[PDB]
UniProtKB/TrEMBL annotation, chain B:
The chain holds residues 1126 to 1147 of 1273 of the full protein. This is Spike protein S2'. It comes from Severe acute respiratory syndrome coronavirus 2.
Length: 49, 22
């Protein structure tokens, strides 16, 4: 939750959580801009789940 | 720019602009 996947291979590096989630979204072929304008809705759904 | 949180005010360089003057 603190450093994403960086610590898996070497020394951990701090990364903001929305920044990490942007990389996760981009990893499945979606432009990273989409996440920014839906952050509140995404957080609400995640909390409910 | 009214939706994203944390944006900043900075300039963007245009490489085409210096080529137009000539």
């Amino acid at each position: 939750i603190t450093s994403g996947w960086t610590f898996g291979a070497g020394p951990a590096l701090q990364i903001p959580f929305p920044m990490q989630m942007a990389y996760r979204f981009n990893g499945i072929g979606v432009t990273q801009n989409v996440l920014y304008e839906n952050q509140k809705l995404i957080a609400n759904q995640f909390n409910s789940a | 720019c009214d939706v994203v949180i944390g944006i900043v005010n900075n300039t963007v360089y245009d490489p085409l602009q210096p080529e137009l003057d000539s």
